[PDB]
Amino acid sequence: TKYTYPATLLCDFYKVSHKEQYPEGTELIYSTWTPRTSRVEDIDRVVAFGFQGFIKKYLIDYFNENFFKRPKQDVVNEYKRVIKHTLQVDDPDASHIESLHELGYLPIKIKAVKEGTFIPIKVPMLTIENTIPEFFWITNYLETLMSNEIWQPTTSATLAYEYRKILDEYAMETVGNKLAVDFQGHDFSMRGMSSLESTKLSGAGHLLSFTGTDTIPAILYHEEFYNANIENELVGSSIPATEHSVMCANGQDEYVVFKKLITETYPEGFVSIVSDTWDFWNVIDTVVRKLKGDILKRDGKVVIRPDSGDPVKIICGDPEAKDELVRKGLIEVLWDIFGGNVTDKGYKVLDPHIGAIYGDAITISRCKEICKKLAAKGFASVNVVFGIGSFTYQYNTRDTFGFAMKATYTVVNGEERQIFKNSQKGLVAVVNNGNELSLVDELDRNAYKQLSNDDILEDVFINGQLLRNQTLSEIRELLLD
Amino acid sequence: TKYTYPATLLCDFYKVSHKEQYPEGTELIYSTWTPRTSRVEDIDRVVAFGFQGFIKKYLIDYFNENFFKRPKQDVVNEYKRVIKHTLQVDDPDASHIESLHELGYLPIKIKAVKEGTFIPIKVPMLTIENTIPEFFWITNYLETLMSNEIWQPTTSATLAYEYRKILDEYAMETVGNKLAVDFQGHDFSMRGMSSLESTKLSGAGHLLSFTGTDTIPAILYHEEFYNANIENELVGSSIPATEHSVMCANGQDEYVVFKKLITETYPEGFVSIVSDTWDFWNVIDTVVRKLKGDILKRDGKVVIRPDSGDPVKIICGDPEAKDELVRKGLIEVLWDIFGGNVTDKGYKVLDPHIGAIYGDAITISRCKEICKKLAAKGFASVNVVFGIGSFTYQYNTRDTFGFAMKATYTVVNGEERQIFKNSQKGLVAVVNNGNELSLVDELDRNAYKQLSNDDILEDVFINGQLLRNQTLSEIRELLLD
Ligand SMILES: NC(=O)c1ccc[n+]([C@@H]2O[C@H](COP(=O)([O-])OP(=O)(O)OC[C@H]3O[C@@H](n4cnc5c(N)ncnc54)[C@H](O)[C@@H]3O)[C@@H](O)[C@H]2O)c1
Ligand SMILES: NC(=O)c1ccc[n+]([C@@H]2O[C@H](COP(=O)([O-])OP(=O)(O)OC[C@H]3O[C@@H](n4cnc5c(N)ncnc54)[C@H](O)[C@@H]3O)[C@@H](O)[C@H]2O)c1
Structure with a gap:
């Protein structure tokens, strides 16, 4: 009997618990993927590569085959079993898993620079957010898996x-x-x-x-x-x-x-x-x-x-x-x-x-x-x-180029807010600034919509739709020419 | 349909070319997996772990689902196509792939120490060999994949x-x-x-x-x-x-x-x-x-x-x-x-x-x-x-514990021969020497057989059947008791 790792449990355990911890009225969570530093001498730019393979493999193929196409009861049961016996919760709540399966697609939007682009240290190359308020929790949920899958292909490329x-x-x-x-x-x-x-x-x-x-x-x-x-x-x-x-x-x-x-x-x-x-x-x-x-x-x-x-x-x-x-x-x-x-x-x-x-x-x-x-x-x-x-x-970590998923922006009861500790704040864009690529942050949704034509981040995945499909030849052209 | 990575091409490219390079009448190749050195201070032993997972996943399930249970013509064609367009061979010879498919199982014998055992540096923990002479080439072929799959779980376990x-x-x-x-x-x-x-x-x-x-x-x-x-x-x-x-x-x-x-x-x-x-x-x-x-x-x-x-x-x-x-x-x-x-x-x-x-x-x-x-x-x-x-x-390599797989023994036209560059030579065994695991090498088949009792390596997988199936509880008890 083939063993299915539930698509709803490809994460750190504490990701499962964050949904209940967000403030009431949380409608939107927006996170960015950035190489924050470089530990390799003479390398201050990274070669953007890997988003498409992850998006096709996990967000489209894996979730459709192993979650959305399966009976709703089965995905609910598989989630409840693991939560019950690993978090010692007698009766886990899976109504959000039910709701996701009834929705029938991943309510997220991912933007990314073209694969092959050189991205300077401290410039984001990908963003992810949720497209429906009810699923504010999905963005953070996916963060671990995305980070697990995309830092090595970029590092190697670089x-x-x-x-x-x-x-x-x-x-x-x-x-x-x-x-x-x-x-x-x-x-x-x-x-x-x-x-x-x-x-x-x-x-x-x-x-x-x-x-x-x-x-x-x-x-x-x-x-x-x-x-x-x-x-x-x-x-x-x-x-x-x-x-x-x-x-x-x-x-x-x-x-x-x-x-x-x-x-x-x-x-x-x-x-x-x-x-x-x-x-x-x-x-x-x-x-x-x-x-x-x-x-x-x-x-x-x-x-x-x-x-x-x-x-x-x-x-x-x-x-x-x-x-x-x-x-x-x-x-x-x-x-x-x-x-x-x-x-x-x-x-x-x-x-x-x-x-x-x-x-x-x-x-x-x-x-x-x-x-x-x-x-x-x-x-x-x-x-x-x-x-x-x-x-x-092989001998690298995701900190070799300082990669991190960071929530930078959230909407709570219609109020826009910036997320950070003490760095990127608010919505982000990357624009051609003279002969360089430059981060723009601290944007609210109005300013970000204004900048959209200049943002070199492109829509890559929304609501189950693949929006950009690059070829190896195209990426090689971008990189080497 | 979905993309199949052929079971016969999970290797370094040159592994494909080695079959025709061996001496005429080669009938057996026998290789060992050894942690040859330690780069971590105060760690002179390794916690053997992972063989069963690799065998189950790839040697049984992957080869059955993606090679043996599929029609002969399909697995011949996929191999020919890759070899043709990546090695510039106009008509690649796939007769050995055809013959393996007709056989219907992997003519392979893997032995290993019990997972959970402490293995000193420079003592082998696993051996692999072919069980039918015509398939002498299979041992070598599997080397890459097995290494790729089993150094990390042991390293982490250690x-x-x-x-x-x-x-x-x-x-x-x-x-x-x-x-x-x-x-x-x-x-x-x-x-x-x-x-x-x-x-x-x-x-x-x-x-x-x-x-x-x-x-x-x-x-x-x-x-x-x-x-x-x-x-x-x-x-x-x-x-x-x-x-x-x-x-x-x-x-x-x-x-x-x-x-x-x-x-x-x-x-x-x-x-x-x-x-x-x-x-x-x-x-x-x-x-x-x-x-x-x-x-x-x-x-x-x-x-x-x-x-x-x-x-x-x-x-x-x-x-x-x-x-x-x-x-x-x-x-x-x-x-x-x-x-x-x-x-x-x-x-x-x-x-x-x-x-x-x-x-x-x-x-x-x-x-x-x-x-x-x-x-x-x-x-x-x-x-x-x-x-x-x-x-x-994450921040390790295969050479963190010096893992390599080396062919140590071969049989050529009935004659036993040792393999080594200028190290283990011939068939090997691991014996308990007063709670001191030691290597015994330079063994012909007769000597290896006389040592079968004291050898702690046990049959794990022969000719398609898993012969030892350890539980997690057994491994934990062996490790900590
Ligand atoms: N339930 C939970 O609370 C939970 C679960 C999972 C993760 N987390 C948190 O997420 C983070 C996990 O990140 P991680 O495990 O990848 O990192 P880590 O905590 O194991 O190590 C990160 C630091 O190690 C050093 N490092 C890493 N690679 C290096 C390299 N090539 N060269 C030099 N130094 C290097 C750096 O100082 C780096 O900042 C942690 O902050 C963790 O606390 C929390
Ligand atoms: N077609 C071909 O000829 C072909 C194909 C594949 C492989 N090979 C050969 O197989 C070997 C490939 O193995 P590899 O890529 O794992 O080795 P590698 O050559 O990339 O590096 C291994 C060596 O680098 C150092 N190293 C590795 N990890 C270290 C660590 N934590 N700390 C300090 N030093 C470390 C060590 O000196 C180690 O001996 C090579 O010898 C390769 O030539 C040949």
């Missing part, structure tokens, strides 16, 4: 963009175009995300900035919620790649192993071969070097993947190593063997038959450092592909 | 127990029993987890040590996967509690608002009131004090909640403060107002009508410091409830 930002600049600095950047950020993180759902949301954020990923469910997530179709557009893509357990199973005859892989198993196209199973630098000096003709013969690219050592020292060289190959580093050594071309900016790019990827403990600062030292050696940034892992995408 | 370990120990020292500890750890973290699924996994981990939670989905998760039932056992419990937005809506006549909350809205039972919306110490010194008789007349408890300042200094006092109230802190001031009882060992316990809860930026170290500084002034540790939030449960 972090992903930072890599992208670095990689774009260096590309323009060292190549003069960014054509290779889409594949330079490669999601490796799925095994280290905390759940398949978190995997999907984080990986979708990654796919806003890059097309390279190993997180298959992220590609399909964009198919499910952002109208993507892999048959018509590059959502994500990846390459055949070996792994340490397979490398160890095949044995120590690394010449024959590599030769079989690149001449027989993958005679053409891309193939990534992890090379540090037994001795990395020996593999470069003795296997790859001996395979030069075969590598140059394939219509494709053999990508070398180290998976240990210091990323910067392995890629760019260790200046204090006695050994020449260790001193030079992978990119220079592969250049020495295979050569390549010179870009319009005077930088060296590897011959397209050989390549490099590094995906162990990659961080934003290490990506920046690798690009910087490579450029100092005359090598373009596009010579390395960065495997961006769970250290980047 | 972190929660850390709090438990402290709260038990101070309880024994200050009161002489642990009767209060079950509610002293209260999960507040839902809005800050990265997804609702991660919320369920983490909160389920929290509920092994405590019964206090605001995470309703975690209680229901234990109902879904761990045979719990809130009608017959105490799975999780909570209380009515106010929030800043509610308090602000009710206005600054705080005496009237508090009095209505405790005499009319919640005349009995527990009720938590957040008291720092405008001035925390004025509320304590003016509102709570003036409500002393009403508070004492209720059949229940009023729980004061601060949500700002330094947690240690608010609870135990700021010794550098000039104001009596601030220097003494919440617990001593509440004692001055209401008094209470004195334990056998000389420690003060607040009158049962009044209480304290703190749930902002709570850490293990802060919990310990608050217990220590309360005891240093003769206050029992049971006087305050700890609201453990997303800072604790």
Whole structure:
């Protein structure tokens, strides 16, 4: 028997108790979603992403399938059972649940900026309110769930963009175009995300900035919620790649192993071969070097993947190593063997038959450092592909960018009031102010209606209706152009 | 129809390519799940938790509903479509998917230690292997998903127990029993987890040590996967509690608002009131004090909640403060107002009508410091409830306890071989060594069989049937007794 988590209990327990605590005559509760701070250096804007997936998944699909379409008695019973046995209330009140189910839709209105927009720290990006006085309580009820579902997709998108930002600049600095950047950020993180759902949301954020990923469910997530179709557009893509357990199973005859892989198993196209199973630098000096003709013969690219050592020292060289190959580093050594071309900016790019990827403990600062030292050696940034892992995408909180749902506005017996402690007060809008986006708050309903044409927040969901349906392609256009 | 993420594509992209890479005649792959290191100080053991949930959710239900019970052609086509348009293969080989579907079950054997067991760092807790040679590739394939799903529930379960370990120990020292500890750890973290699924996994981990939670989905998760039932056992419990937005809506006549909350809205039972919306110490010194008789007349408890300042200094006092109230802190001031009882060992316990809860930026170290500084002034540790939030449960990685899944053993054309990079080699077992769980590795099948008796890993899932079905009550008794 399939277990249904009631749509009316996807919250903190105390959310259930707030309805009775509001003042009598409360008709409206209005709350905003804001990144209040940044804990990541050089990042003062966040990449708005994730509202549509949450709205389609939970407010439309989940509530319709598991609440509104079901018998009224069943949703009432499921709510009463949990309240009765967890709050020790002998006879829980569910008349409001009855009334919501009889209404037949969620009486809320959600506005949000376009997904893909850069939002400065301390500028709200989404608002939610109730559209019928009787359900003043619904807004606050949903807050927990919304926060639970939308802070990770934005965080990942933002972090992903930072890599992208670095990689774009260096590309323009060292190549003069960014054509290779889409594949330079490669999601490796799925095994280290905390759940398949978190995997999907984080990986979708990654796919806003890059097309390279190993997180298959992220590609399909964009198919499910952002109208993507892999048959018509590059959502994500990846390459055949070996792994340490397979490398160890095949044995120590690394010449024959590599030769079989690149001449027989993958005679053409891309193939990534992890090379540090037994001795990395020996593999470069003795296997790859001996395979030069075969590598140059394939219509494709053999990508070398180290998976240990210091990323910067392995890629760019260790200046204090006695050994020449260790001193030079992978990119220079592969250049020495295979050569390549010179870009319009005077930088060296590897011959397209050989390549490099590094995906162990990659961080934003290490990506920046690798690009910087490579450029100092005359090598373009596009010579390395960065495997961006769970250290980047999992190791955050919702306070990494200071996100919070805050009630800022309420109507009680027709009286407008501002909600705060001691920050945003009253109704809010975000307007183009010169070349920046600016918060406007302390608005009453009249002033807010006046500003509506200038508010870059758009109606996204009212009363069960989806009002805006963005595509992955549209969001990528907004973000990167 | 609704979007199906194919059961055969919940993995890193390169896992798809590994099948054709193994040596010819590979017949068995055997992998272990191990916490290889600890990044949390004073935590050298991990609380095994989550395997049963993952197996039930994905290995049984997801593969049955979305792969086996569906027509062969559909599951072949979905896989082919993704592989074609993401790996640039014009005709992907799906014969192995077809063969798995024809088999009708997962030819898989998973063994694990009992959930609730303390596992030392660097000792494996779970193994996985294929039961039919042709499906050697399935073990590797499942690796990613299983990791993605089982590191968080264990990590949370371990972190929660850390709090438990402290709260038990101070309880024994200050009161002489642990009767209060079950509610002293209260999960507040839902809005800050990265997804609702991660919320369920983490909160389920929290509920092994405590019964206090605001995470309703975690209680229901234990109902879904761990045979719990809130009608017959105490799975999780909570209380009515106010929030800043509610308090602000009710206005600054705080005496009237508090009095209505405790005499009319919640005349009995527990009720938590957040008291720092405008001035925390004025509320304590003016509102709570003036409500002393009403508070004492209720059949229940009023729980004061601060949500700002330094947690240690608010609870135990700021010794550098000039104001009596601030220097003494919440617990001593509440004692001055209401008094209470004195334990056998000389420690003060607040009158049962009044209480304290703190749930902002709570850490293990802060919990310990608050217990220590309360005891240093003769206050029992049971006087305050700890609201453990997303800072604790979200801000981790898989490598917080060094979790990795590594193939350690393979059979190739009948020959047993060890797998390891340059660590566990071969088949493994975990034996009790005088209440010291130790790893035994480098075992061939014969040696592993001779050790079957002393191996604490038990059969959990073989060839489609769940063989061990632990209850939440069993796990709690194993953990705490
Ligand atoms: N197609 C492919 O080749 C492919 C696909 C997927 C994964 N992979 C590989 O699998 C691994 C991915 O695993 P990942 O993304 O979880 O690791 P990661 O590379 O993102 O980071 C793991 C390392 O970062 C540090 N780290 C992580 N958590 C930390 C913490 N709390 N505190 C301090 N340091 C911490 C540690 O040094 C850790 O070893 C990688 O080795 C990847 O290359 C490869
Ligand atoms: N029944 C109830 O009263 C109830 C229930 C649920 C939640 N709540 C309240 O809602 C809030 C829960 O929020 P939470 O659990 O996500 O946060 P938390 O209270 O566990 O921690 C928040 C603080 O921890 C620090 N933090 C978080 N991430 C950080 C990071 N990357 N780096 C450095 N510091 C970081 C910060 O100081 C942050 O302000 C709390 O205020 C809680 O009291 C109350």
